[PDB]
Coordinates of C-alpha atoms and ligand atoms in Angstrom, one line a residue:
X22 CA 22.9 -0.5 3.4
X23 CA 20.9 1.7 1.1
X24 CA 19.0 0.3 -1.5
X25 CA 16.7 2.1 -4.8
X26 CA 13.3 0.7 -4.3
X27 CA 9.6 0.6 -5.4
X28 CA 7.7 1.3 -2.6
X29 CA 3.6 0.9 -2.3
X30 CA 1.3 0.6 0.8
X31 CA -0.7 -2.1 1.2
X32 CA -2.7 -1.0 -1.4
X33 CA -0.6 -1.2 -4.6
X34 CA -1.3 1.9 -5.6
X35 CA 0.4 5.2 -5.8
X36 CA 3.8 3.7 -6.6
X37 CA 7.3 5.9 -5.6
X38 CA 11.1 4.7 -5.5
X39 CA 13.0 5.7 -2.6
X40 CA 16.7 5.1 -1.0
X41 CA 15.3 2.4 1.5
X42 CA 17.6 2.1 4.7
X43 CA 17.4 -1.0 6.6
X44 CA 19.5 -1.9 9.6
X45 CA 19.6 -3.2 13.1
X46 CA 22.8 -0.3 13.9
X47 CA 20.4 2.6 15.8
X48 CA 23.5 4.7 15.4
X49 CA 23.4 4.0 11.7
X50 CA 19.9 5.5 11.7
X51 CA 21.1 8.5 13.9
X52 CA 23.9 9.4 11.2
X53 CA 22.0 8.7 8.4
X54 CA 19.1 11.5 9.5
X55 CA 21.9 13.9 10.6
X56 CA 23.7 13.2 7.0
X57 CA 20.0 13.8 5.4
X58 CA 19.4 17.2 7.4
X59 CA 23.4 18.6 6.2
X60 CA 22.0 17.7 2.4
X61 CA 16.7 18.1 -0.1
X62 CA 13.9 15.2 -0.4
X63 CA 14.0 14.2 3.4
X64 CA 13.5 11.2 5.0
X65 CA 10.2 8.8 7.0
X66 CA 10.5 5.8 8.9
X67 CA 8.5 2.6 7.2
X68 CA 7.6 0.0 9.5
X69 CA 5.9 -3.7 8.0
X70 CA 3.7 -1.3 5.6
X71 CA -0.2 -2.3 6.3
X72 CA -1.1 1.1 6.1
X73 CA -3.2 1.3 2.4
X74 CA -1.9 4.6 1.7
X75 CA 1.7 6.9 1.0
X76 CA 2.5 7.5 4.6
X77 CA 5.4 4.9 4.4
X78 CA 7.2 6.2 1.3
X79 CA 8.9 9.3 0.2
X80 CA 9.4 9.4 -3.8
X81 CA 13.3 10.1 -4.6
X82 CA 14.2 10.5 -0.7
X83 CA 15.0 8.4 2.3
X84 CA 12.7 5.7 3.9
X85 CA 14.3 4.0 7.1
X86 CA 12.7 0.8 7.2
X87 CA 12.6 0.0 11.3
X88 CA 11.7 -3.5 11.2
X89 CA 15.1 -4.7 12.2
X90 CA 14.8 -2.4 15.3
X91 CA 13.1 -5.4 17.1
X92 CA 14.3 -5.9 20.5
X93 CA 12.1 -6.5 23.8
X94 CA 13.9 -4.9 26.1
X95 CA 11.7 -5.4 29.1
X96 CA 8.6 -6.7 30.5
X97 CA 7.1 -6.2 33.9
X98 CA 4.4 -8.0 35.3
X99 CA 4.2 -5.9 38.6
X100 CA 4.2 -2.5 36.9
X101 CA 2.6 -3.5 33.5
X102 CA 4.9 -1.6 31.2
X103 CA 7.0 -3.2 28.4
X104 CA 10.2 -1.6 27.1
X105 CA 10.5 -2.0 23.1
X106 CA 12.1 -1.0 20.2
X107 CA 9.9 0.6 18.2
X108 CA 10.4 -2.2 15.5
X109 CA 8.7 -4.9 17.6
X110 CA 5.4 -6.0 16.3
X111 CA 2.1 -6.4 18.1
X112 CA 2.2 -10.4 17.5
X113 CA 5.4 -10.9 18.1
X114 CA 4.8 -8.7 21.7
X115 CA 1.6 -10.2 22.4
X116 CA 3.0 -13.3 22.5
X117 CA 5.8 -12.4 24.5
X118 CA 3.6 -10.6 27.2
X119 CA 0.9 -13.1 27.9
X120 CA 3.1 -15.3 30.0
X121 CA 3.2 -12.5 32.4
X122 CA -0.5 -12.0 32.5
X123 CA -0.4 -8.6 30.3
X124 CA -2.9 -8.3 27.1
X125 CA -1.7 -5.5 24.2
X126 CA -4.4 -2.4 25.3
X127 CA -5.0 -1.7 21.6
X128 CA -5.3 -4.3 18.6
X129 CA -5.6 -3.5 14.9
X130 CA -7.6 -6.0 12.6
X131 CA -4.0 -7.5 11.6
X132 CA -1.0 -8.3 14.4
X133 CA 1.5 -7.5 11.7
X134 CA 1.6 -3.7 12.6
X135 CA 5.0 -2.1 14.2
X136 CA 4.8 0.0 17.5
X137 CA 6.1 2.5 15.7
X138 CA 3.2 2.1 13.3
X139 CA 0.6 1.7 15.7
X140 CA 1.9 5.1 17.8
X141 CA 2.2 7.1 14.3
X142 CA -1.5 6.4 13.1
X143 CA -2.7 6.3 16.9
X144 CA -4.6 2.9 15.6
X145 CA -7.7 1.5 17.3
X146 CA -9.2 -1.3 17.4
X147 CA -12.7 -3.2 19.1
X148 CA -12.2 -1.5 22.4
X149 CA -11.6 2.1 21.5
X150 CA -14.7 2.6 23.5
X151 CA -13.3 1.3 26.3
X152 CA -10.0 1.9 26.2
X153 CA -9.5 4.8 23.5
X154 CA -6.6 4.4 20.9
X155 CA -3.1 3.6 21.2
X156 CA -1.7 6.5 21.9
X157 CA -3.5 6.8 25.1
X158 CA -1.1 4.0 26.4
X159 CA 2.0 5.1 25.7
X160 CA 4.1 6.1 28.7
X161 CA 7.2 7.3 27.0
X162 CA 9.0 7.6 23.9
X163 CA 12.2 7.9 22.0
X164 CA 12.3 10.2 19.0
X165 CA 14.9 10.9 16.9
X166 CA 14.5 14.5 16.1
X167 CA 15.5 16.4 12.9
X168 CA 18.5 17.8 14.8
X169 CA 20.2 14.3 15.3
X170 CA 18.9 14.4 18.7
X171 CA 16.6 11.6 20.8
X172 CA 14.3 13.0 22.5
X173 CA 12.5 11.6 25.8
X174 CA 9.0 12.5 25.0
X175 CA 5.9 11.6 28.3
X176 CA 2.5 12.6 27.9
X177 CA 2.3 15.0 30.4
X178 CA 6.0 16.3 30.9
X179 CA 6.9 19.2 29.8
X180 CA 7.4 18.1 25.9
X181 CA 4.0 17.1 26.0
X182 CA 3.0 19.1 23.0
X183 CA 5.5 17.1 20.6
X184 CA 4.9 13.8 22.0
X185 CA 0.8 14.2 21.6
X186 CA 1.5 15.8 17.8
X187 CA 4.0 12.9 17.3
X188 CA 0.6 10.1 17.9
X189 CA -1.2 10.3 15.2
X190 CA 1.5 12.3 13.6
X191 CA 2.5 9.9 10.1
X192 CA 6.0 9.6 11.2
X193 CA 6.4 13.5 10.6
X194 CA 7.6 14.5 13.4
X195 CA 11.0 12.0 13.1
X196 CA 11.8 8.2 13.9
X197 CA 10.7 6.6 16.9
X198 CA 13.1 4.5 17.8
X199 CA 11.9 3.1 21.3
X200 CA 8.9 3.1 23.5
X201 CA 7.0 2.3 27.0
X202 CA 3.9 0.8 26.8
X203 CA 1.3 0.5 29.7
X204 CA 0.0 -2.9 29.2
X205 CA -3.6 -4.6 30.3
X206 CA -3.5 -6.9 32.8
X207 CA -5.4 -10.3 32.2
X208 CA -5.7 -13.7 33.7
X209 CA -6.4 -15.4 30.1
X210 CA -5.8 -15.3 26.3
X211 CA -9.6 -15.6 26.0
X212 CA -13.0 -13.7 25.3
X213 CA -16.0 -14.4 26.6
X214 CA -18.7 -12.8 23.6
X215 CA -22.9 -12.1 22.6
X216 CA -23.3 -12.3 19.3
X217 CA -26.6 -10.4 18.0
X218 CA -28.4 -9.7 14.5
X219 CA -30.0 -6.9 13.5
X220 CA -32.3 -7.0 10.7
X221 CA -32.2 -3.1 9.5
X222 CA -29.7 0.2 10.4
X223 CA -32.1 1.2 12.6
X224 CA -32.0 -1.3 14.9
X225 CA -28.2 -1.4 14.3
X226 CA -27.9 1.9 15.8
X227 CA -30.4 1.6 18.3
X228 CA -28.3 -1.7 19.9
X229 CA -25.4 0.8 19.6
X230 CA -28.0 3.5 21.4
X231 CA -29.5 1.5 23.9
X232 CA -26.8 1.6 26.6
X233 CA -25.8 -1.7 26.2
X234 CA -22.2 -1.0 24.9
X235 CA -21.3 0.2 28.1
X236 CA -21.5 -3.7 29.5
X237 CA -18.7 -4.7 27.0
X238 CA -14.9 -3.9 26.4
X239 CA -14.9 -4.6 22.6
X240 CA -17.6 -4.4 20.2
X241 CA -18.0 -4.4 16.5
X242 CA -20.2 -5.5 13.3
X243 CA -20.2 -6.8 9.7
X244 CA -22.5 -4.5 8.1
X245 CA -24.5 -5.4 5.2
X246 CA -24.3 -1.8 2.7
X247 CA -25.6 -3.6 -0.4
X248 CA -29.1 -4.5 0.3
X249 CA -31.4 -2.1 -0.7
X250 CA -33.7 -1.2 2.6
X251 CA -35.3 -1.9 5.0
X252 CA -32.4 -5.0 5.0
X253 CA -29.6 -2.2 4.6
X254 CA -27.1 -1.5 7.9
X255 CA -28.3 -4.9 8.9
X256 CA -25.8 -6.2 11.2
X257 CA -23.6 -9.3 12.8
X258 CA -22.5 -7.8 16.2
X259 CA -19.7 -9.4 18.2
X260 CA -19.2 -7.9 21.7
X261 CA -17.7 -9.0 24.6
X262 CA -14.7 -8.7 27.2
X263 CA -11.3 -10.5 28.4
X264 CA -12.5 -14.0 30.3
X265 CA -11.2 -15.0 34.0
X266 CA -9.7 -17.9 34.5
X267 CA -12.9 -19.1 36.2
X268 CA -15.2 -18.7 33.3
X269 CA -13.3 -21.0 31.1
X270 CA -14.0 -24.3 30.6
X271 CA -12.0 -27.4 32.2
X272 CA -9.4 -28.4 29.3
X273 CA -8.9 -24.8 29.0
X274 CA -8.1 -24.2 32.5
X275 CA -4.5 -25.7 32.9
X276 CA -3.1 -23.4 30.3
X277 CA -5.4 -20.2 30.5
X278 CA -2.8 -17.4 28.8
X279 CA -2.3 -19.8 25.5
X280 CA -2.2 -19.1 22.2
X281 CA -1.9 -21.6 19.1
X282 CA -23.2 -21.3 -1.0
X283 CA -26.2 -23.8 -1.3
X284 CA -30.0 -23.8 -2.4
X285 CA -30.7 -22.4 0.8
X286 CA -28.3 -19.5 1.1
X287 CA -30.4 -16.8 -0.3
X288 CA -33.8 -17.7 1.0
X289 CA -35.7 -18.0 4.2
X290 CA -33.6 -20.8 5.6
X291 CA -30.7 -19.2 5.0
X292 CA -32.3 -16.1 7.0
X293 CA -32.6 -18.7 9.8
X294 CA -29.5 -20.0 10.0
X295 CA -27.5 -17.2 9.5
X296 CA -29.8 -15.4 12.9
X297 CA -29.1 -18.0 14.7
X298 CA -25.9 -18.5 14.1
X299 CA -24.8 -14.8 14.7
X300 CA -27.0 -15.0 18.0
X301 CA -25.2 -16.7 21.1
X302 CA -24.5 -15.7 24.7
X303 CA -21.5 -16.0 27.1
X304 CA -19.2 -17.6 23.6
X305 CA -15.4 -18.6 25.1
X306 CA -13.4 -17.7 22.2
X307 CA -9.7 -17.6 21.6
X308 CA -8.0 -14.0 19.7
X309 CA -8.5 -15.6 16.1
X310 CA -12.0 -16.7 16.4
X311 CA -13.3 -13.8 18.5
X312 CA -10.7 -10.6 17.0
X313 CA -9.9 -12.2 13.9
X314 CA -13.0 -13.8 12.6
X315 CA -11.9 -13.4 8.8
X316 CA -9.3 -16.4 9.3
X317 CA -11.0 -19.0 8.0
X318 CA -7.3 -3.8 -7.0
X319 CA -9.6 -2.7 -4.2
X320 CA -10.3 1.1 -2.7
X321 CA -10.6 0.9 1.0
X322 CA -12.3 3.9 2.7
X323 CA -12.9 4.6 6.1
X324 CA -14.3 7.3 7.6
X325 CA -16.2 8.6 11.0
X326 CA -19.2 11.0 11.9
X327 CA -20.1 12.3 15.1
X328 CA -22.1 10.7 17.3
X329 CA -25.1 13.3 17.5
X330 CA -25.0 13.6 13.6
X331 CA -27.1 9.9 13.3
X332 CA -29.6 10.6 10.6
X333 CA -26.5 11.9 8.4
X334 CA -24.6 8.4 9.2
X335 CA -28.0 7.1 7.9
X336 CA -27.6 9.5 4.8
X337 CA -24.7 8.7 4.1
X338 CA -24.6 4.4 4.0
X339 CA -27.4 5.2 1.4
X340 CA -25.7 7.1 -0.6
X341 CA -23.1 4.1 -0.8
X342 CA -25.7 1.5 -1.3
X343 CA -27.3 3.3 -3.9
X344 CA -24.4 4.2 -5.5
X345 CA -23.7 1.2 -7.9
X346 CA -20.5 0.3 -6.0
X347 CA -20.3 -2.7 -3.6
X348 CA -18.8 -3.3 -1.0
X349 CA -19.0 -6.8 0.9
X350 CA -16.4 -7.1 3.9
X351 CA -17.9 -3.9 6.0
X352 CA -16.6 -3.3 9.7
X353 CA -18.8 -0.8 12.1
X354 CA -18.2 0.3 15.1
X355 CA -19.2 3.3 17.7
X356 CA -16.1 5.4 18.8
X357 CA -15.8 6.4 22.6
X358 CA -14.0 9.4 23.1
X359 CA -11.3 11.0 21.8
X360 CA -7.4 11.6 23.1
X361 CA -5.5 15.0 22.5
X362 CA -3.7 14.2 19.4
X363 CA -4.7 17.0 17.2
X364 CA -4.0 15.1 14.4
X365 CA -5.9 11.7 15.9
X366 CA -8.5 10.0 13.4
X367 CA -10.8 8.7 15.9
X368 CA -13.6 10.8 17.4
X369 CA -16.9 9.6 19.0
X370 CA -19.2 8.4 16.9
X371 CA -20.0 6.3 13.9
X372 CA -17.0 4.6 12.2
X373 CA -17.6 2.1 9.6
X374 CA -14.4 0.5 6.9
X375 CA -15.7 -0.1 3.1
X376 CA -14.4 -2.1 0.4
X377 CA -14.7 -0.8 -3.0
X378 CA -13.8 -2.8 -5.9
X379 CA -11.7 -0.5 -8.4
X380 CA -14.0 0.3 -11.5
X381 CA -15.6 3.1 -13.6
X382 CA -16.3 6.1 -11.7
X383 CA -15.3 5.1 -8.1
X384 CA -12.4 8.2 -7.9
X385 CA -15.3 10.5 -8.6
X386 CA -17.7 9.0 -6.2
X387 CA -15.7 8.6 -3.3
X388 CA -14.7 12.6 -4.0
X389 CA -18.3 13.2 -3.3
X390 CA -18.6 10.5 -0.1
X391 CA -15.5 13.1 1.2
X392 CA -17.5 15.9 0.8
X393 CA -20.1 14.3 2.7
X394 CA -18.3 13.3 5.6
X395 CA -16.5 16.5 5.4
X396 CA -20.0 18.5 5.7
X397 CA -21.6 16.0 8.1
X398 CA -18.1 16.6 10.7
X399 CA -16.6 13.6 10.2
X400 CA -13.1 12.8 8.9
X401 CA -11.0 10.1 6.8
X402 CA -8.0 8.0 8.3
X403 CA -4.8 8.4 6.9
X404 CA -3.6 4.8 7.2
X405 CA -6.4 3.9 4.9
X406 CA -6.3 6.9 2.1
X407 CA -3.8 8.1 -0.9
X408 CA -6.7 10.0 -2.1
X409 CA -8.6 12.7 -1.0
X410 CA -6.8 16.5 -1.2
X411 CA -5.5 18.8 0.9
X412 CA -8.3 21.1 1.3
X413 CA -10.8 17.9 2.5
X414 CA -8.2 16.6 4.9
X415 CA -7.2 20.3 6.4
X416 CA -11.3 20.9 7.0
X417 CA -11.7 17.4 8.3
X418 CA -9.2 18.0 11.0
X419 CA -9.7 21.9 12.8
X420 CA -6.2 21.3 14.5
X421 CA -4.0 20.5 11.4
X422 CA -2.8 24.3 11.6
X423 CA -1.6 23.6 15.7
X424 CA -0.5 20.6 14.8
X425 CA 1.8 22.1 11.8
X426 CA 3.2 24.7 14.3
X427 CA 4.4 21.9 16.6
X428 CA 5.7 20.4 13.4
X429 CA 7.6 23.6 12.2
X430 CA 9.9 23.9 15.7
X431 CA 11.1 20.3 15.5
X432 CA 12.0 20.4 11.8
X433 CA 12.4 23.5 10.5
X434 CA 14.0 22.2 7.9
X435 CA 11.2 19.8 6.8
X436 CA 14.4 16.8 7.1
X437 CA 10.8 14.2 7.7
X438 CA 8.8 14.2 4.4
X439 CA 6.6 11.6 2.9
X440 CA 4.4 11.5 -0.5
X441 CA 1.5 11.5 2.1
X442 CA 2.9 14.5 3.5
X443 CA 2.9 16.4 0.1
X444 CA -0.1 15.4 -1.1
X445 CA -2.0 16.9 2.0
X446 CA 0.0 19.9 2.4
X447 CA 1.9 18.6 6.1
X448 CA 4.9 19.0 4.6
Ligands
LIG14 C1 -5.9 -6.0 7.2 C2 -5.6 -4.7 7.9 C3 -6.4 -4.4 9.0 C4 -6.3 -3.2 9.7 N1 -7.1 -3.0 10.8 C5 -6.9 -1.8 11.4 C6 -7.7 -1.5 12.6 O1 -8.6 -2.3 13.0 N2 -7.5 -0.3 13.2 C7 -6.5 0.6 12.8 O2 -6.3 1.7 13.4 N3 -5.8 0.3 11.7 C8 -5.9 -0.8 11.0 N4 -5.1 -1.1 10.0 C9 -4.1 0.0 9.6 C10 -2.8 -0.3 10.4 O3 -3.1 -0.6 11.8 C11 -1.9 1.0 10.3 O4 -1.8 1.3 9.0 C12 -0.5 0.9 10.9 O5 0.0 2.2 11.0 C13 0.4 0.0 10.1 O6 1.6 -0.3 10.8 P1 3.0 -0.5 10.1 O7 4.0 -0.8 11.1 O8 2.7 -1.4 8.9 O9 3.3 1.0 9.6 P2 3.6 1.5 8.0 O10 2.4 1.3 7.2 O11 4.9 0.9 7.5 O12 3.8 3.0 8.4 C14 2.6 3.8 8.7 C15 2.9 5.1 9.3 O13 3.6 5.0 10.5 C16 4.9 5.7 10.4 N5 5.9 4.9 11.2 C17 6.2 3.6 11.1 N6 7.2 3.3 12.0 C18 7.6 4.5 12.5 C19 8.7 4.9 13.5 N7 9.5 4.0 14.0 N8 8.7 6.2 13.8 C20 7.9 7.1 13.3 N9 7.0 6.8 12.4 C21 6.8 5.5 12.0 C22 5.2 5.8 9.0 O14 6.1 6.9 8.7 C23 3.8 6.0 8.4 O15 3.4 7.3 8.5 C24 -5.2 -2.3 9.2 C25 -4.4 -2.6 8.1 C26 -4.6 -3.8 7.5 C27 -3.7 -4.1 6.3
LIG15 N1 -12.0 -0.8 9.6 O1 -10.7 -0.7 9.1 C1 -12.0 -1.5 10.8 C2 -12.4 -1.0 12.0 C3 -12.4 -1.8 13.2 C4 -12.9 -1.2 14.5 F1 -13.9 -1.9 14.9 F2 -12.0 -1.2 15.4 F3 -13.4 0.0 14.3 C5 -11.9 -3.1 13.2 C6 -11.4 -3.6 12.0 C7 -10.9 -5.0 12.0 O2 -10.9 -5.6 13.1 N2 -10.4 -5.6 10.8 C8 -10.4 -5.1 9.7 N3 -9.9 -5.8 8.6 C9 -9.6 -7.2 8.8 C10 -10.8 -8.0 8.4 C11 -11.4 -7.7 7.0 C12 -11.5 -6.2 6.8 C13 -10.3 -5.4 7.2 S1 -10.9 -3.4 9.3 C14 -11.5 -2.8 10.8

């Protein structure tokens, strides 16, 4: 069932046909990475393709699209694990898990992400804090190796060094085809949130500094990088935890794991209303109005720096603010720690996602924001970029040449290639 097709990520951008593959048969996929590996462009798994960037295509080669890989094979209330194929989808398995009591540990800014996705750019979400990435909750995987081979891969067995290069690892290390996933136990499909406002980045980062974040299990902010200062890095932040059954309110309680401009704008007023509606204490809020507040020919750029590095953060957001480009929808948050993956994006510190509206002179500028976060520590995710070289990316990330090595003895025959890998020199 192979088809020529014009693949992009999310992004429309960076176009490339490929062979796509899509089937249900896993036996079909076995044969047709074993009949790839005797013939060479290579092959990478695609899942539903929200990554922005070229991880999920492979110009003139093979993409298995895993989506029809969707089968829950388990769920377990007592131990907390599910069993999936690696097709499954974080809505789809949220929604099949919270009748046990069991919340997904990490969730991106969009449910329609594969497990497969989710293990492959060890994704994060408003708890990495708390709970770190997704990677950190994996229990076991299945990966179909360059050798025609599935391979039961743990975190601590003894092929612990391919399953932690496989997180993280842009489907370069072969196809997942099936995982175990340690889920979070809960008593409700609700938050209970604070809501604050900051008025500047300094009192942004001092709310991020002042301990408080240790009191919740997911925090973010909308970040205002436009206004000149004092107003720039002014901030709507959104924190708060997983509700009991006893903090919500009476309707709510019979069904507790559910799911289902002006004049004044700009002026003083405005300033009002907006403070106090961004300020708010103990909030019940379902997933959509707490997680995914937003549901009601772009560059997008995301990128992290150290936690001790603060005045370069600072240095940074105003070199984008004074920069002539604009971005509106910004997302900040502070990074706990990190996990093993050598190849992991997140690191402690300060992560914040633009929004760049393609024009004049953005390719050049956000060259020189890499070089930035390059010199100031900090790195770029790969779900997000089909932009920055091989030289940047290789600095940003100190274990690319162990994680390469790992690479090398389970495909020495580089059978799993993507235009992603190519372009960074992973290949
Ligand atoms: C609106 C929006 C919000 C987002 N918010 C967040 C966020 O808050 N946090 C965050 O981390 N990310 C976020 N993302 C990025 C998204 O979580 C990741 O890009 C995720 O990897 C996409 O999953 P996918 O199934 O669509 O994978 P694809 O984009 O199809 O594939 C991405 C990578 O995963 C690999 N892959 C997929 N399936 C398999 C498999 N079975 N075996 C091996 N490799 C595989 C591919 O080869 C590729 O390298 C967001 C994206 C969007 C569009
Ligand atoms: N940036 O991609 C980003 C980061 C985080 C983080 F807090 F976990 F770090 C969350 C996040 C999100 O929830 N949603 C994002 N989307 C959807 C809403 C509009 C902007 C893109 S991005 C995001």
């Amino acid at each position: 069932t192979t088809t020529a097709t014009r693949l992009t990520g999310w992004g429309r951008t960076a176009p490339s046909v490929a062979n796509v593959l899509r089937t249900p048969d896993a036996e079909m996929i076995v044969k047709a990475v074993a009949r790839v590996a005797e013939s060479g462009r290579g092959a990478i798994a695609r899942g539903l393709g929200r990554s922005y960037g070229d991880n999920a295509q492979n110009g003139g080669g093979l993409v298995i699209d895993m989506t029809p890989l969707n089968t829950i094979h388990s769920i377990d209330a007592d131990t907390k694990l599910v069993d999936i194929d690696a097709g499954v989808n974080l809505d789809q398995l949220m929604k099949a898990a919270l009748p046990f009591g069991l919340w997904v540990p990490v969730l991106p800014g969009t449910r329609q992400v594969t497990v497969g996705g989710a293990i492959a750019c060890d994704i994060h979400g408003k708890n990495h804090h708390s709970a770190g990435s997704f990677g950190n909750h994996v229990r076991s995987m299945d990966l179909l190796t360059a050798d025609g081979e599935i391979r039961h891969l743990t975190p601590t067995g003894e092929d612990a060094e391919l399953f932690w290069a496989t997180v993280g690892g842009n489907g370069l290390t072969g196809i997942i085809m099936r995982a175990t996933i340690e889920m979070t136990p809960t008593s409700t499909a609700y938050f209970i949130a604070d809501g604050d406002v900051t008025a500047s980045l300094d009192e942004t980062i001092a709310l991020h500094s002042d301990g408080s974040e240790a009191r919740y299990t997911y925090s973010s902010a909308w970040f205002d990088a436009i206004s000149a200062p004092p107003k720039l890095g002014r901030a709507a932040v959104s924190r708060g935890r997983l509700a009991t059954v006893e903090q919500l309110p009476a309707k709510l309680r019979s069904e507790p794991l559910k799911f289902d401009a002006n004049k004044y704008t700009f002026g003083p007023i405005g300033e009002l209303w907006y403070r106090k509606s961004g300020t708010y204490r103990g909030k019940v809020q379902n997933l959509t109005q707490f997680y995914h507040p937003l549901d009601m020919g772009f560059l997008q750029y995301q990128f992290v720096i150290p936690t001790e590095a603060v005045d370069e953060f600072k240095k940074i957001i105003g070199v984008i603010q004074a920069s002539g480009h604009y971005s509106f929808l910004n997302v900040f948050k502070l990074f706990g720690p990190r996990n093993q993956a050598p190849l992991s994006f997140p690191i402690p510190g300060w992560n914040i996602c633009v929004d760049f509206p393609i024009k004049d002179g953005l390719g050049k500028f956000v060259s020189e924001l890499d070089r930035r976060v390059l010199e100031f520590g900090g790195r770029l995710y790969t779900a997000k970029d089909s932009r920055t070289t091989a030289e940047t990316f290789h600095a940003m990330y100190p274990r690319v040449d162990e994680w390469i090595s790992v690479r090398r003895k389970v495909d020495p025959l580089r059978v799993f290639a993507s235009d992603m890998a190519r372009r960074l020199e992973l290949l």
